Design an enzyme around this catalytic site. Structure first.
Site, PDB file in Angstrom:
ATOM      1  N   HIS A   1      43.493  -9.867  -2.396  1.00  0.00           N
ATOM      2  CA  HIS A   1      44.854  -9.729  -2.907  1.00  0.00           C
ATOM      3  C   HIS A   1      44.908  -9.538  -4.424  1.00  0.00           C
ATOM      4  CE1 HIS A   1      45.342 -13.748  -4.710  1.00  0.00           C
ATOM      5  NE2 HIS A   1      44.866 -14.296  -3.608  1.00  0.00           N
TER       6      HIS A   1
ATOM      7  N   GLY B   1      46.229 -19.538 -10.873  1.00  0.00           N
ATOM      8  CA  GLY B   1      44.985 -19.093 -11.464  1.00  0.00           C
ATOM      9  C   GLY B   1      43.730 -19.605 -10.789  1.00  0.00           C
TER      10      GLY B   1
ATOM     11  N   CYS C   1      42.841 -19.069  -7.486  1.00  0.00           N
ATOM     12  CA  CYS C   1      42.361 -18.209  -6.408  1.00  0.00           C
ATOM     13  C   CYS C   1      40.978 -17.666  -6.731  1.00  0.00           C
ATOM     14  CB  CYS C   1      43.327 -17.047  -6.178  1.00  0.00           C
ATOM     15  SG  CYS C   1      44.819 -17.482  -5.245  1.00  0.00           S
TER      16      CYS C   1
HETATM   17  C1  LIG Z   1      57.269 -16.591  -0.240  1.00  0.00           C
HETATM   18  O1  LIG Z   1      56.037 -16.940  -0.821  1.00  0.00           O
HETATM   19  C2  LIG Z   1      55.636 -18.283  -0.684  1.00  0.00           C
HETATM   20  C3  LIG Z   1      56.532 -19.261  -0.248  1.00  0.00           C
HETATM   21  C4  LIG Z   1      56.116 -20.590  -0.125  1.00  0.00           C
HETATM   22  C5  LIG Z   1      54.806 -20.955  -0.436  1.00  0.00           C
HETATM   23  C6  LIG Z   1      53.895 -19.970  -0.878  1.00  0.00           C
HETATM   24  N1  LIG Z   1      52.597 -20.041  -1.235  1.00  0.00           N
HETATM   25  C7  LIG Z   1      52.141 -18.850  -1.591  1.00  0.00           C
HETATM   26  C8  LIG Z   1      50.720 -18.522  -2.066  1.00  0.00           C
HETATM   27  O2  LIG Z   1      49.876 -19.362  -2.112  1.00  0.00           O
HETATM   28  N2  LIG Z   1      50.424 -17.163  -2.492  1.00  0.00           N
HETATM   29  C9  LIG Z   1      49.088 -16.804  -2.937  1.00  0.00           C
HETATM   30  C10 LIG Z   1      48.976 -15.283  -3.043  1.00  0.00           C
HETATM   31  C11 LIG Z   1      49.089 -14.576  -1.689  1.00  0.00           C
HETATM   32  C12 LIG Z   1      48.923 -13.074  -1.888  1.00  0.00           C
HETATM   33  C13 LIG Z   1      48.076 -15.106  -0.670  1.00  0.00           C
HETATM   34  C14 LIG Z   1      48.795 -17.422  -4.297  1.00  0.00           C
HETATM   35  O3  LIG Z   1      49.617 -17.385  -5.147  1.00  0.00           O
HETATM   36  N3  LIG Z   1      47.500 -18.042  -4.551  1.00  0.00           N
HETATM   37  C15 LIG Z   1      47.243 -18.602  -5.871  1.00  0.00           C
HETATM   38  C16 LIG Z   1      46.872 -20.093  -5.832  1.00  0.00           C
HETATM   39  C17 LIG Z   1      48.056 -20.994  -5.472  1.00  0.00           C
HETATM   40  C18 LIG Z   1      49.176 -20.998  -6.669  1.00  0.00           C
HETATM   41  C19 LIG Z   1      49.543 -22.294  -6.844  1.00  0.00           C
HETATM   42  N4  LIG Z   1      48.465 -23.180  -6.112  1.00  0.00           N
HETATM   43  C20 LIG Z   1      47.631 -22.313  -5.334  1.00  0.00           C
HETATM   44  O4  LIG Z   1      46.722 -22.678  -4.662  1.00  0.00           O
HETATM   45  C21 LIG Z   1      46.197 -17.759  -6.637  1.00  0.00           C
HETATM   46  O5  LIG Z   1      45.325 -18.270  -7.262  1.00  0.00           O
HETATM   47  C22 LIG Z   1      46.481 -16.265  -6.799  1.00  0.00           C
HETATM   48  O6  LIG Z   1      47.763 -16.188  -7.389  1.00  0.00           O
HETATM   49  P1  LIG Z   1      47.995 -16.270  -9.038  1.00  0.00           P
HETATM   50  O7  LIG Z   1      47.564 -14.950  -9.653  1.00  0.00           O
HETATM   51  O8  LIG Z   1      47.210 -17.414  -9.651  1.00  0.00           O
HETATM   52  O9  LIG Z   1      49.459 -16.509  -9.356  1.00  0.00           O
HETATM   53  C23 LIG Z   1      53.181 -17.927  -1.458  1.00  0.00           C
HETATM   54  C24 LIG Z   1      54.307 -18.650  -1.001  1.00  0.00           C
END
Ligand SMILES: COc1cccc2[nH]c(C(=O)N[C@@H](CC(C)C)C(=O)N[C@@H](C[C@@H]3CCNC3=O)C(=O)COP(=O)(O)O)cc12
Lengths: 296, 296
Positions: A39, A141, A143
């Protein structure tokens, strides 16, 4: 008795930063390949319902920027495997440990090296829950952070972090891009199944309490695997199998407490409670130590 | 929210094995000096009433075997500083990180890299208790294992392990060889004074619960500082000082909850318990996260 993580040095030397456009996260650099969540190729817009095949076909090598410390790595090829992006790079990582990719099962434990912007920030020990989520501590950050075990110089990588669920738990893939749990890499609210307690790990932890001089919960009684599983269902505990019992044999041999005798102990704690007393300084029954973890 | 340790790689590269006679333990190799507990020089007897000055003057450089992996390091000098032996060696450690030696105060946290025969086994986070002990996990050959913080790539070494006490807790020194607490590197009848809860850390962790979206334990009361201390001391909580109040100022300004308002909540939590709830992941009031730890 403390939860312990594996020493993280072998993995620290593999962490890099991967950037595609304005999206940045962590990657794993082993030999001449960087692994990271697919992603990363998504903008905030594509994230609602992305077409990964389409988004990747229109990317070229020049769309990916890989930084190992203060050194840019040139991407010379790119590929997807399930939910993991594979960036072939200029240079082999000279710090590559002996390693393999493994898929773990619920109830097994591993260490997570939490990373931000390609920089390791902390290490902690955790367990893959029966509902395939991780009770972790990940912020924006994080991921691409990885989970691992180490066995005699060989790093077994088992987890790469992708997302946070609404309940605050975490979901990811193995290093071949296969998700743990019924989750998809999309920007949507997804709920995990009702979690349960890892029964074989609670029993292991009671053995460690006995081994450490806590003996008050031991009793004279035994139970049946059938009737324990009845109380197991009532309290949302994973059912105990004959395989679990054979695993705890080395602790049953070492302490003189048969597993169904320990199950009798655990049955009474589940009903009667802890009487306010304590086991290994815990008010709750701890279920993120495996039998293997205890014997070490 | 997890209790995270620092990534341990910078310390793993400094761990060595020190053998003198039949005693082996861990040493810390920084530049051209190996630091280790001076009781490496004690024989079976020795331990009850060692005279370290007399035991050391009888040693030659070649009585000390130092092994960094498979490589033997040549000792070319030695001296004793308080309770640590300092072995000058042939070779500066090429993996020496930026480092300093610091002495910490009770309530402060750090990571421990538990080691056996100079090989790292696990890493965990812990706190110096108010009675100057460590609730660790140390097996038979863990002496010389060290505790540390890492700030901006500089490793602050604060602890070296020396002894286990009959309660199961651990005692040791700073890296200048001065013990934390009233203990001696001597096998006598010494036990830790009664231990108490680190109140300023509990309040930090409650502020951390408010920042992670928990408010259920707040109430409408406040308290004077003296009334709070009179109550908390009845639960074996450390007195809260005006320094501790100033230290929580930033967390108070961020959450909008005045420090003495959080103290009133803690008074009520001690009176009521959790009533089947958890604050972060705990059914316990956690006291091993500092105000500094919480801000990050
Ligand atoms: C409607 O949507 C939602 C509603 C309710 C709950 C939800 N939860 C997520 C989600 O988890 N979304 C992934 C991205 C998708 C594409 C899988 C994400 O955001 N992963 C983070 C780590 C996360 C950030 C905070 N704690 C973590 O573990 C990254 O590391 C990359 O993203 P960043 O570049 O760091 O912002 C979407 C969502």
């Amino acid at each position: 008795f403390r939860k312990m993580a594996f020493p993280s040095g072998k993995v620290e030397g593999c962490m890099v930063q991967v950037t595609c456009g304005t999206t940045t996260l962590n990657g794993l650099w082993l030999d001449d390949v960087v692994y990271c969540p697919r992603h990363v190729i998504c903008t905030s817009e594509d994230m609602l319902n992305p077409n990964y095949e389409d988004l990747l076909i229109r990317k070229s090598n020049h769309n990916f920027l890989v930084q190992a410390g203060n050194v840019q790595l040139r991407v010379i090829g790119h590929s997807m495997q399930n939910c993991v992006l594979k960036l072939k790079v200029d240079t082999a990582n000279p710090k590559t440990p002996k390693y393999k990719f493994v898929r773990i099962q619920p109830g097994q434990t591993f260490s997570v090296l939490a990373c931000y912007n390609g920089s390791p920030s902390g290490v902690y020990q955790c367990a893959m829950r029966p509902n395939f989520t991780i009770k972790g501590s990940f912020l924006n950050g994080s991921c691409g952070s990885v989970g691992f075990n180490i066995d005699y110089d060989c790093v077994s990588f088992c987890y790469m972090h992708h997302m946070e669920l609404p309940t605050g738990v975490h979901a990811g893939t193995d290093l071949e891009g296969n998700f743990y749990g019924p989750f998809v890499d999309r920007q949507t609210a997804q709920a995990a199944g009702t979690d349960t307690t890892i029964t074989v790990n609670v029993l292991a932890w009671l053995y460690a309490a006995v081994i450490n001089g806590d003996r008050w919960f031991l009793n004279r009684f035994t139970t049946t695997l059938n009737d324990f599983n009845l109380v197991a269902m009532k309290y949302n505990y994973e059912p105990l199998t004959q395989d679990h019992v054979d695993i705890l044999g080395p602790l049953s041999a070492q302490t003189g407490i048969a597993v169904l005798d320990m199950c009798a102990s655990l049955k009474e704690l589940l009903q009667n409670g802890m009487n306010g007393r304590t086991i290994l300084g815990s008010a709750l029954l701890e279920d993120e130590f495996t039998p293997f973890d205890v014997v070490r």
